[PDB]
Design an enzyme around this catalytic site. Structure first.
Site, PDB file in Angstrom:
ATOM      1  N   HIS A 123      19.568  14.987  17.819  1.00 62.61           N
ATOM      2  CA  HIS A 123      18.697  15.515  16.791  1.00 62.61           C
ATOM      3  C   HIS A 123      18.001  14.644  16.298  1.00 62.61           C
ATOM      4  O   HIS A 123      16.945  14.483  15.161  1.00 62.61           O
ATOM      5  CB  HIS A 123      20.376  14.325  16.012  1.00 62.61           C
ATOM      6  CG  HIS A 123      21.102  15.187  16.342  1.00 62.61           C
ATOM      7  ND1 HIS A 123      21.764  16.580  15.677  1.00 62.61           N
ATOM      8  CD2 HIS A 123      22.581  15.418  16.627  1.00 62.61           C
ATOM      9  CE1 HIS A 123      22.870  16.793  16.218  1.00 62.61           C
ATOM     10  NE2 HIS A 123      23.449  15.880  16.657  1.00 62.61           N
ATOM     11  N   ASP A 160      26.013  21.831  22.670  1.00 62.45           N
ATOM     12  CA  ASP A 160      26.356  21.260  22.234  1.00 62.45           C
ATOM     13  C   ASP A 160      26.698  21.747  20.863  1.00 62.45           C
ATOM     14  O   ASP A 160      26.927  22.360  20.470  1.00 62.45           O
ATOM     15  CB  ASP A 160      25.532  20.270  21.489  1.00 62.45           C
ATOM     16  CG  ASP A 160      26.253  18.883  21.606  1.00 62.45           C
ATOM     17  OD1 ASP A 160      26.979  19.062  20.092  1.00 62.45           O
ATOM     18  OD2 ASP A 160      26.777  17.918  21.535  1.00 62.45           O
ATOM     19  N   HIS A 162      27.254  20.758  18.463  1.00 66.45           N
ATOM     20  CA  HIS A 162      26.123  20.636  16.561  1.00 66.45           C
ATOM     21  C   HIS A 162      25.204  21.400  17.432  1.00 66.45           C
ATOM     22  O   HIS A 162      24.063  21.236  18.308  1.00 66.45           O
ATOM     23  CB  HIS A 162      26.106  19.357  16.564  1.00 66.45           C
ATOM     24  CG  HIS A 162      27.221  18.525  16.141  1.00 66.45           C
ATOM     25  ND1 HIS A 162      28.095  18.177  17.627  1.00 66.45           N
ATOM     26  CD2 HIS A 162      28.483  18.332  15.127  1.00 66.45           C
ATOM     27  CE1 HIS A 162      29.088  17.331  16.792  1.00 66.45           C
ATOM     28  NE2 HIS A 162      29.099  17.801  15.230  1.00 66.45           N
ATOM     29  N   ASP A 253      31.319  18.816  23.083  1.00 60.39           N
ATOM     30  CA  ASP A 253      32.114  18.988  22.570  1.00 60.39           C
ATOM     31  C   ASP A 253      32.766  20.310  21.881  1.00 60.39           C
ATOM     32  O   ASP A 253      33.422  20.481  20.919  1.00 60.39           O
ATOM     33  CB  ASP A 253      31.162  18.181  21.231  1.00 60.39           C
ATOM     34  CG  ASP A 253      30.473  18.596  20.757  1.00 60.39           C
ATOM     35  OD1 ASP A 253      29.566  19.096  21.268  1.00 60.39           O
ATOM     36  OD2 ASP A 253      29.104  17.281  19.888  1.00 60.39           O
ATOM     37  N   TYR A 293      33.202  13.554  23.053  1.00 61.98           N
ATOM     38  CA  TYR A 293      34.251  12.675  21.941  1.00 61.98           C
ATOM     39  C   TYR A 293      35.760  12.470  22.059  1.00 61.98           C
ATOM     40  O   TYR A 293      36.450  11.869  21.949  1.00 61.98           O
ATOM     41  CB  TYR A 293      34.316  13.039  20.337  1.00 61.98           C
ATOM     42  CG  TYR A 293      32.439  12.956  20.107  1.00 61.98           C
ATOM     43  CD1 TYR A 293      32.155  11.582  19.893  1.00 61.98           C
ATOM     44  CD2 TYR A 293      31.635  13.969  19.688  1.00 61.98           C
ATOM     45  CE1 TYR A 293      30.645  11.262  19.650  1.00 61.98           C
ATOM     46  CE2 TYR A 293      31.056  13.852  19.933  1.00 61.98           C
ATOM     47  CZ  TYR A 293      30.598  12.775  19.916  1.00 61.98           C
ATOM     48  OH  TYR A 293      29.031  12.592  19.257  1.00 61.98           O
TER      49      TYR A 293
HETATM   50  C1  LIG Z   1      26.574  13.054  13.793  1.00 65.96           C
HETATM   51  C2  LIG Z   1      27.548  13.181  14.713  1.00 65.96           C
HETATM   52  C3  LIG Z   1      27.722  14.271  15.856  1.00 65.96           C
HETATM   53  C4  LIG Z   1      27.364  14.089  16.847  1.00 65.96           C
HETATM   54  C5  LIG Z   1      26.815  15.007  17.658  1.00 65.96           C
HETATM   55  O1  LIG Z   1      27.980  14.899  18.323  1.00 65.96           O
HETATM   56  N1  LIG Z   1      25.774  15.566  18.266  1.00 65.96           N
HETATM   57  O2  LIG Z   1      26.089  16.390  19.070  1.00 65.96           O
HETATM   58  C6  LIG Z   1      29.324  13.379  13.781  1.00 65.96           C
HETATM   59  C7  LIG Z   1      29.162  13.235  12.915  1.00 65.96           C
HETATM   60  C8  LIG Z   1      29.387  14.233  11.647  1.00 65.96           C
HETATM   61  C9  LIG Z   1      30.676  12.182  12.436  1.00 65.96           C
HETATM   62  O3  LIG Z   1      31.496  12.455  12.988  1.00 65.96           O
HETATM   63  C10 LIG Z   1      30.579  10.829  12.000  1.00 65.96           C
HETATM   64  C11 LIG Z   1      31.823   9.998  11.880  1.00 65.96           C
HETATM   65  C12 LIG Z   1      31.274   8.881  11.015  1.00 65.96           C
HETATM   66  C13 LIG Z   1      29.994   8.383  10.855  1.00 65.96           C
HETATM   67  N2  LIG Z   1      29.862   7.032   9.714  1.00 65.96           N
HETATM   68  C14 LIG Z   1      31.171   6.114  10.396  1.00 65.96           C
HETATM   69  C15 LIG Z   1      28.709   7.335   8.845  1.00 65.96           C
HETATM   70  C16 LIG Z   1      29.102   9.582  10.333  1.00 65.96           C
HETATM   71  C17 LIG Z   1      29.046  10.445  11.230  1.00 65.96           C
HETATM   72  K   LIG Z   2      23.017  23.607  20.235  1.00 66.77           K
HETATM   73 ZN   LIG Z   3      27.919  17.556  18.770  1.00 66.89          ZN
END
Ligand SMILES: CC(/C=C/C(=O)NO)=C\[C@@H](C)C(=O)c1ccc(N(C)C)cc1
Ligand SMILES: [K+]
Ligand SMILES: [Zn+2]
Ligand SMILES: [K+]
Length: 347
Positions: A123, A160, A162, A253, A293
């Site tokens: 990202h 992935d 995402h 994931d 995760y």
């Molecule tokens: C970015 C991501 C996964 C990335 C990934 O795996 N890319 O491959 C997941 C985000 C949506 C998420 O779940 C989240 C949880 C808590 C939070 N804060 C408490 C600020 C902010 C975001």
């Molecule tokens: K992807």
């Molecule tokens: Zn991801």
């Protein structure tokens, strides 16, 4: 004739256990000992400047000499980012671990490689952090393969769950690096909620045709859907593109059991996907850890990928080889959006 493994990554919520559980299961299943243990290194500023702006590197370097309040203030200016005084140092090792495998693979010292690194990369953008990434591990490694190892064409595959919008942005105008991403989308309702994650974003200028998004618009996709997507879209383009190196954004994931991916891909599927990619670029293939995760789901996905890297026989797939109709729609629309650019799709 070996498979390299790099692990430095812990000393940095959805967890250092992410990477230590992978190593544990790699050791237990006998795969760790069968790998060539490769040492990590720290990225240099010049390697970082392949992809990131000067002002961003300076800002990120000053992150260690910041107080807990300075970090939280900066982190809120980004989308889904947590900062701590050790992030910059660990992120430098994260990039450098991929660069170590690229060296070993391009010089034929190893056949392929897998970096078990955190923080993730896909990202991260030219001038900002995003979704837990500070530097774009794979984007850097691709330009580094071109500059130092004289690669003309790099294929980046992102499985992935995402969308790796950072990799997309960096190479958006660049026909020498082909980016393929398959990801949960749900018409933008799934993070990162980007119109440019749709299959209509095919690249711009001379990059047109070299950005391929496959967005899932239903949850619960399975191995048959990824296999069908690889066999009918990604691999035909790959053989026509003829890359000299394949990099994989290897998040897990999407594996069954992941608390946030919402997919039902069996870990064994990633044996097949990895095996397919070995037929391209003379097997010069480097995987680098992204998301994941469910500690156990993630470790199984790594192990299934590692088995193919090592050349072990492909496993039995418990799921149907048939893709669902929602997957066939997504696949059909991406093929249609990329038809004018790839002869191999124009059946
Ligand atoms: C970015 C991501 C996964 C990335 C990934 O795996 N890319 O491959 C997941 C985000 C949506 C998420 O779940 C989240 C949880 C808590 C939070 N804060 C408490 C600020 C902010 C975001
Ligand atoms: K992807
Ligand atoms: Zn991801
Ligand atoms: K591109």
């Amino acid at each position: 004739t070996g498979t390299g493994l790099v692990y430095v990554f812990t000393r940095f919520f959805p967890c250092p256990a992410r990477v230590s559980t992978v190593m544990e299961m790699l050791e237990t299943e006998g795969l760790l000992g069968r790998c060539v243990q490769v040492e990590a290194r720290a990225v240099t500023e010049d390697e970082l400047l392949l992809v990131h702006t000067k002002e961003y590197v300076e800002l990120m370097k000053s992150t260690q000499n910041m107080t807990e309040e300075e970090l939280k203030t900066l982190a809120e200016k980004y989308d889904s980012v947590y900062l701590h005084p050790g992030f910059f140092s660990s992120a430098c090792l994260s990039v450098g671990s991929v660069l170590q495998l690229v060296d070993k693979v391009m010089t034929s010292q190893l056949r392929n490689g897998f970096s078990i690194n955190r923080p993730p990369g896909h990202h991260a953008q030219a001038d900002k952090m995003n979704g837990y990434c500070m530097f774009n591990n794979l984007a850097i490694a691709a330009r580094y393969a071109q500059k130092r190892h004289r690669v003309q064409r790099v294929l980046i595959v992102d499985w992935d769950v995402h969308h790796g919008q950072g990799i997309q942005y960096i190479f958006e105008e660049d026909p020498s690096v082909l980016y393929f991403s398959v990801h949960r989308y749900e018409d933008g309702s799934f993070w990162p909620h980007l119109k440019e994650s749709d299959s209509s974003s095919v690249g711009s200028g001379a990059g047109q045709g070299y950005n391929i998004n496959l967005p899932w618009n239903k949850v619960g996709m399975e191995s048959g859907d990824y296999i069908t997507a690889f066999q009918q879209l990604l691999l035909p383009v790959a053989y026509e593109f003829q890359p000299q190196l394949v990099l994989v954004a290897a998040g897990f994931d999407a594996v069954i059991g992941d608390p946030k991916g919402g997919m039902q891909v069996s870990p064994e599927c990633f044996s097949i996907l990895t095996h397919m990619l070995k037929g391209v670029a003379q097997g010069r293939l480097v995987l680098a850890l992204e998301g994941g995760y469910n500690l156990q789901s993630t470790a199984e996905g790594v192990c299934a990928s590692m088995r193919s890297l090592l050349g072990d026989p492909c496993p039995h797939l418990p799921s149907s080889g048939a893709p669902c109709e929602s997957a066939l729609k997504s696949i059909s629309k991406t093929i249609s959006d990329l038809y004018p650019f790839w002869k191999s799709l124009q059946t």
